[PDB]
């Protein structure tokens, strides 16, 4: 019967925007090349997490404005037992700054658009951010926003300010964000003043949670006698034709009857009443086959059909 020995020289380095590198070394006394002892890492704060690794380092993505706390230990898992050393721990102190100076209510929206003319036929993502000034933030502070997607990091330059000159919004017409992206967009906003020091704020956004899908265009509807035909084009997006869920709303303006069709197609042909005026709208979302559930687009601006006479 014997036990394990804890790792040493446990460090935590800020390598990037919401990006940390955890490093440590194997305990000198323990066995050298026992290839099936590994390391367990536990994140104690801000959010509790737990995972294994076999390397003496670990890169991780997490917010850093609330500080950071991690523990690492040596483990050996038989499938009857788990053997564990004591924890070695390390921390990153919460960034300096008086209370309430930090930005509140950060909101971010991405949108897919196209170029212009024959430069290349592709898609740009635009990023729009808004927020409120810190409540007791000294009237002098200026706020600055950075974002990181993948390897790319940028600072904004097109700001919208309030009445006392402070940045409360940001506009990126062109960005490094992938239109079909799965990765996490990291946004940091720090600030500066002559008096007090300002608490930086930062957030992690999954693209599917903030991608503002565009509305379907050229919604066309016609009634020929008893036959109703609705067509519409796939919205402006990098995701192809077969990746969209559609909801077609057919509203009877006379009696308020509301017919809603859910379909993955681009045209709906069916039967309807001659003698009522209808307004139709269509909205779209990205299918779960192509990406985890996200947001619905706005409704197409309504078109009218029936009672042509």
């Amino acid at each position: 019967k014997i036990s394990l020995l804890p790792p040493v020289n446990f460090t935590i380095k800020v390598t990037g925007l919401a990006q940390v590198l955890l490093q440590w070394k194997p305990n000198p006394d323990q066995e050298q090349r026992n290839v099936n002892l590994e390391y367990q890492v536990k994140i104690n704060a801000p959010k509790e997490d737990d995972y294994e690794t076999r390397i003496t380092e670990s890169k991780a993505v997490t917010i850093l404005h609330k500080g950071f706390s991690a523990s690492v230990r040596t483990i050996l898992q038989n499938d009857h037992s788990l053997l564990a050393s004591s924890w070695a721990s390390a921390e990153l102190h919460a960034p300096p700054g008086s209370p309430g100076t930090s930005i509140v209510n950060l909101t971010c929206t991405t949108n897919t658009t196209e170029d212009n003319y024959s430069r290349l036929r592709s898609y740009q993502v635009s990023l729009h951010c808004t927020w409120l000034v810190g409540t007791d933030a000294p009237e002098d502070t200026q706020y600055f926003l950075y974002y990181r997607y993948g390897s790319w990091t940028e600072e904004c330059q097109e700001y919208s300010k309030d009445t006392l000159g402070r940045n409360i919004a940001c506009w990126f017409p062109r960005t490094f964000i992938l239109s079909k992206g799965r990765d996490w967009l990291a946004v940091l906003v720090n600030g500066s003043s002559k008096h007090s020091a300002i608490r930086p704020f930062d957030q992690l956004f999954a693209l599917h949670a903030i991608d503002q899908i565009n509305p379907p265009l050229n919604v066309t509807a016609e009634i020929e006698g008893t036959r109703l035909s609705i067509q519409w084009e796939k919205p402006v997006s990098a995701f192809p034709i077969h990746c969209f869920d559609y909801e077609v709303k057919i509203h009877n303006t006379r009696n308020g009857y509301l017919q809603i069709e859910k379909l993955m197609t681009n045209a709906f042909i069916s039967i309807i009443d001659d003698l009522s005026k209808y307004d139709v709208q269509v909205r779209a979302a990205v299918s779960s086959m192509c990406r985890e559930a996200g947001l619905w687009s706005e409704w197409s601006q309504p078109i009218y059909v029936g009672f042509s006479r």
């Binding site: 997490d49 390397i55 380092e57 890169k59 991780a60």
Partner: peptide, 18 residues
């Protein structure tokens, strides 16, 4: 070298975007 990114808040791993 040769490890993925640990997405902490989502308890997940992330590698690439081929």
């Amino acid at each position: 070298v040769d490890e993925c990114w640990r997405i902490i808040a989502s308890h997940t791993w992330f590698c690439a975007e081929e």
